[PDB]
Amino acid sequence: YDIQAWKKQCEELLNLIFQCEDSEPFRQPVDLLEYPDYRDIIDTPMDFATVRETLEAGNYESPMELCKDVRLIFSNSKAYTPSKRSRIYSMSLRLSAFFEEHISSVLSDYKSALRFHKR
Numbered sequence: 172y173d174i175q176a177w178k179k180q181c182e183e184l185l186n187l188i189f190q191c192e193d194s195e196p197f198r199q200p201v202d203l204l205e206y207p208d209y210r211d212i213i214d215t216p217m218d219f220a221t222v223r224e225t226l227e228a229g230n231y232e233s234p235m236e237l238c239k240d241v242r243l244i245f246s247n248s249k250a251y252t253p254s255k256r257s258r259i260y261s262m263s264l265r266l267s268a269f270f271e272e273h274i275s276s277v278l279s280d281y282k283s284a285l286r287f288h289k290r
């Protein structure tokens with residue numbers, strides 16, 4: 172029923188993601204000194220600190236918008252990798268599976284709560 176519950180649920184999920192060793196490459200914006208051609212490949216950089224900051228600033232209206240940004244972190248990694256076997260891309264796939272498994276109920280509860288609100 173709670174149309175606002177998704178926000179704390181997303182904060183707690185982001186805390187789990189930061190505790191996860193697989194999030195290490197994605198915790199802060201990609202360093203262009205480390206990867207000089209990154210912006211030649213990636214149009215819209217995204218990282219978990221930016222997601223957390225957007226959420227804490229009150230700049231997400233729904234968990235769907237947060238999901239879109241988290242999914243962009245993973246699609247950027249898939250686009251930048253030269254190999255399906257790279258260490259960082261492999262970490263992104265595990266972290267994506269963990270994220271999708273935990274965000275499913277957040278989106279479901281939010282959409283259900285909003286449908287109840289607008290009934």
Ligand SMILES: O=C(NC1CC1)c1cnn2cccnc12
Nearest residue numbers: 196201247248251252257259260
């Ligand atoms: O997403 C990647 N890098 C960004 C987060 C730092 C990334 C994916 N595969 N890969 C291989 C070598 C170097 N960096 C990568």
